[PDB]
Amino acid sequence: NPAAHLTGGPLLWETQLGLAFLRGLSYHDGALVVTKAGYYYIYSKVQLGGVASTITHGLYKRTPRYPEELELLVSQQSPNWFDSSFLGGVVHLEAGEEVVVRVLDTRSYFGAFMV
Amino acid sequence: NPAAHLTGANSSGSGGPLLWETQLGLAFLRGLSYHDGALVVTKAGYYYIYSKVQLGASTITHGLYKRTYPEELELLVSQQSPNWFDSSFLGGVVHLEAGEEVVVRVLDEGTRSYFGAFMV
Amino acid sequence: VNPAAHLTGANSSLTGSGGPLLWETQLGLAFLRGLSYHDGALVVTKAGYYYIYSKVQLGGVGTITHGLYKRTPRYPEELELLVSQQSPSNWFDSSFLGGVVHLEAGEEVVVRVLDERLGTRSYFGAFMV
């Protein structure tokens, strides 16, 4: 029932409008913040294009008590020209917990929904 | 309740809106309809939608498109540039009204290709 | 509990075994909730529609099929559910599959990769919808 889609340091996103929405989840500084604890399916798609040739696209759990981010779902990819990266998966999130998208070195998005 | 998984059928330009199997094998429709390539919503609300397209400048586009207004609103799209094979997957939660339709297109226009949705 | 599971960290079954990828089921981000696990398979307890998914992290040195397959009683052959063919000096590539399938009590789903090489980089999960 809680859910969020969000559209194109951690990455940053539009949280309204049109396709962007928050619904039972907060936001601050690129991150989805969880209010109701449970299992969420979290996902992110990132469009890439260019001209280690190796890009990493990840979802990370941040907890304010701790600096260090914990990896959740992570993809590595090498490559006139376009590549798209998608990650999805289910994670147990407690109230408080935040999730961000990072990509190391419009079309893209970031989202979740409780399952 | 509402959910569907549709699997690739033999189309068919224009873009074009891919056509789908709704009943044989793994395909099914449960609380959603289908009309000429389109999943059609019946119960308003937030749906996770997805499509996977098996591909087989030289640049392919894969997208999920809403109809309501006139015209087609891009919902989710990827570009890629691949004896070759590649696969393109898109998913995400979008709000849909009873009456809205969702379709799939790929440029330079599949059996391991599919299209589906469920209410979230 | 709405049945669900997330399994992590693929590795291959014993060479010559014929078996599928094996996964971590308890530690870290891995859990099983209202599904069971047996030698690589998620085993369905409660019949219905599930969104099943798997991501596999690929990479080598110089065609790969990543699939989710169903095992059903008295059917010697694994049935395809969702499959992807990809074809990529070191390289890296990731393959994601997701989709809603109907599964009966007693049915099993496994993940395979052809050919297998190949925590957070590889995974296999599901939830009832």
Curated annotation (Swiss-Prot), chain B:
Annotated glycan sites: 10
Location within or outside the cell: Secreted
Highest taxon above the source species: Eukaryota
Positions on the Extracellular side per record topology: 1-120
Domain THD: 2-120
Protein name, entry field: Tumor necrosis factor ligand superfamily member 14, soluble form
Entire protein: shown range: 93 to 240 of 240
